[PDB]
């Protein structure tokens, strides 16, 4: 089997991408944030505290003839940005882009933190990291991809995120018309539960490529590119007037600047992030101080190849027995 679904930016900055997902019978379509940095499929629901729902579409398990409570199961998750959610668990039929999984754990939120409530465009998350990170207790549950894998034509999914435009998530096949050149594949470590890999270096603008190993994760659920302070300083030093501000929370630069590109290495290959992808626009409405798309990871503990980086590529998440990541230009 295969599936193919369009993913759409939630706003004009590409802060996140939503993908429609069919849950239950008859189908309830919710728009979920596909997140290769986590491993829970959770939704706003008829069980969510009413004051914490503000415009989201909810899953109502009592209206689904295929829903079943997963007795005793609870979940609770905290994300790197400080947001969180928790609740109980149903199994139900879940379909993405024509690919159907029966018996998928659908984690129904009883509580969500304010950042979720305040984002009316995201009805939940669909985790695509390794199932060892799933938070369901006392019996850990599998991701949608793990449940689908055996049925797929090939045990892969691909992320093709757009710049200020829709893109595609495909399951079970590699669309050879969706990228240019070849795909260069790189080894993955699953030791932390992430799609963790080692970039071979970077260049700033037209500058020389610096060969240096940068371990990090491919995370579609993180907006920006978080890299070591040395690398980030080298980038922003090429932008007149750019500076790091603790009170704003990262590197800001003049909205009148033209940003240089940023290149990252994948083996001997190179992925070029255009400068315009690094502009996250005014810090506040009307401000001439623009918020940078490349930020330091020094306070995170891990480097993160988020959407800024991934949307410059066609990315293969290869879930074979020995997993690998693939990157192509497009
Ligand atoms: C020989 C280089 N090479 C292949 C890169 C390519 O796709 O061309 C590799 O080392 C690996 C790929 C995946 C796991 S290791």
Residue with tokens 């949608």: 144
- Can you read off the two tokens belonging to residue 21? 């997902």
- Can you read off the two tokens belonging to residue 222? 């993180």
The pair phi, psi for residue 29, each rounded to 5°, is -95, 120
Q: How many CA atoms lie within 13 A of 97 on its CB side?
A: 24
Q: Which of residues 174, 195, 216 is at a domain's end? A: 174
Q: Are 129 and 232 members of one domain? A: no
List the one residue out of 182, 181, 185 whose CA is nearest residue 198: 185
CATH number of the CATH domain containing 22 = 2.40.70.10
Do the Cβ atoms of 76 and 86 come closer than 8 Å? yes
Question: Is any ligand 1 atom within 6 A of the Cβ of residue 181?
Answer: no
Contacts of 291 (CB under 8 A, 6+ apart): 248, 250, 251, 252, 280, 281, 282, 283
Q: Are 165 and 282 members of one domain? A: no
Resolution (A): 1.1
**Parallel/antiparallel/unpaired status of strands 184-187 and 324-328:** antiparallel
Q: Are 256 and 186 members of one domain? A: yes
Question: Is any ligand 1 atom within 6 A of the Cβ of residue 55?
Answer: no
Do the Cβ atoms of 276 and 259 come closer than 8 Å? yes
Q: Which of residues 174, 191, 211 is at a domain's end? A: 174
CA angle 171, 268, 222 (to 5 degrees): 45
Question: Cis link prior to 17 (omega < 30° from 0)?
Answer: no
Q: In what order do the strands lie in the sheet with 250-254?
A: 243-245, 250-254, 289-292, 279-282
Residue with tokens 């693939």: 326
Q: Are 206 and 83 members of one domain? A: no
Q: Are 101 and 134 members of one domain? A: yes
Question: Is any ligand 1 atom within 6 A of the Cβ of residue 267?
Answer: yes
Residue with tokens 């509580």: 111
Distance 188 CA to ligand 1 centre (A): 11
Do the Cβ atoms of 114 and 120 come closer than 8 Å? no
What is the spatial distance between Cα 187 and Cα 10, in angstroms, rounded to a whole number?
31
Q: Are 163 and 53 members of one domain? A: yes
The question of whether 62 is a catalytic residue gets the answer no
CA angle 84, 96, 314 (to 5 degrees): 85
Looking at residue 129, the DSSP 8-state letter turns out to be: S
- Can you read off the two tokens belonging to residue 74? 């609870």
Contacts of 241 (CB under 8 A, 6+ apart): 253, 254, 257
Q: Are 53 and 190 members of one domain? A: no
Per the structure, the complete domain to which residue 118 belongs is given by 5-174
The pair phi, psi for residue 310, each rounded to 5°, is -65, -30
* Cα distance between the two ends of the chain: 25
Q: Are 115 and 229 members of one domain? A: no
CA angle 75, 126, 18 (to 5 degrees): 135
Q: Is 66 helix (H, G, I), strand (E, B) or coil?
A: coil
Do the Cβ atoms of 201 and 209 come closer than 8 Å? yes
Q: Which of residues 158, 174, 190 is at a domain's end? A: 174
CA quadruple 103, 108, 113, 115: dihedral sign: positive
Q: Are 222 and 251 members of one domain? A: yes
Question: Is any ligand 1 atom within 6 A of the Cβ of residue 237?
Answer: no
**Parallel/antiparallel/unpaired status of strands 225-227 and 294-296:** parallel
Q: Where are the alpha helices (DSSP H) in 107-195?
A: 114-117, 144-148
The pair phi, psi for residue 177, each rounded to 5°, is -90, -5
Structure determination technique employed: X-ray
- Count of the separate structural domains present in the chain: 2
Do the Cβ atoms of 146 and 133 come closer than 8 Å? no
List the one residue out of 107, 267, 122 whose CA is nearest residue 198: 267
Q: Are 111 and 40 members of one domain? A: yes
Buried b or exposed e, range 281-306, using 16+ CB within 10 angstroms: eebeeeeeebbbbbbbbeeeeebbbb
Q: Are 218 and 142 members of one domain? A: no
Do the Cβ atoms of 235 and 309 come closer than 8 Å? no
Q: Where are the alpha helices (DSSP H) in 6-161?
A: 114-117, 144-148
Distances (CA, A) of 83 to 59, 88, 208, 246, 314: 21, 18, 39, 20, 28
- 272 — alpha (psi -120 to 50), left (phi > 0) or beta? beta
The question of whether 35 is a catalytic residue gets the answer yes
How distant is the alpha carbon of residue 122 from its chain centre? 13
Q: Are 65 and 213 members of one domain? A: no
What is the spatial distance between Cα 234 and Cα 322, in angstroms, rounded to a whole number?
35
């Amino acid at each position: 089997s295969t599936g193919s679904a369009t993913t759409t930016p939630i706003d004009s900055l590409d802060d996140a991408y939503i993908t429609p997902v069919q849950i239950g019978t008859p189908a309830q379509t919710l728009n979920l944030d596909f997140d290769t940095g986590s491993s829970d499929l959770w939704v706003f629901s008829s069980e969510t505290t009413a004051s914490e729902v503000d415009g989201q579409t909810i899953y109502t398990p009592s209206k689904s003839t295929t829903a079943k409570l997963l007795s005793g199961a609870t979940w609770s998750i905290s994300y790197g940005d400080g947001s969180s959610s928790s609740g109980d668990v149903y199994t139900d039929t879940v379909s993405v882009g024509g690919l159907t999984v029966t018996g998928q754990a659908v984690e129904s939120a009883k509580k969500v933190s304010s950042s979720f409530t305040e984002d009316s465009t995201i009805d939940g998350l669909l985790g695509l990291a390794f199932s060892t990170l799933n938070t369901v207790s006392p019996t850990q549950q599998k991701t949608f991809f793990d449940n689908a894998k055996a049925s797929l034509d090939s045990p892969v999914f691909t992320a093709d995120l757009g710049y200020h435009a829709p893109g595609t998530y495909n399951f079970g096949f590699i669309d050879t018309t969706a990228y240019t050149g070849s795909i260069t594949y790189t080894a993955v470590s699953t030791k932390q539960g992430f799609w963790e890999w080692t970039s071979t270096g970077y260049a700033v603008g037209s500058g020389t490529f610096k060969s240096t190993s940068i371990d990090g994760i491919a995370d579609t659920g993180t907006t920006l590119l978080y890299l070591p302070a040395t690398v980030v300083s080298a980038y922003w030093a090429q932008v007149s007037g750019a500076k790091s501000s603790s009170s704003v929370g990262g590197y800001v630069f003049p909205c009148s600047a033209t940003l240089p590109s940023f290149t990252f290495g994948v083996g001997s290959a190179r992925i070029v992030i255009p400068g315009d992808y690094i502009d996250f626009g005014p810090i506040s409405t009307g401000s001439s101080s623009c918020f940078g798309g490349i930020q330091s990871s020094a306070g995170i503990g891990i480097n993160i190849f988020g959407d800024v980086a991934l949307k410059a590529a066609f990315v293969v998440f290869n879930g074979a027995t020995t997993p690998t990541l693939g990157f192509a230009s497009k």
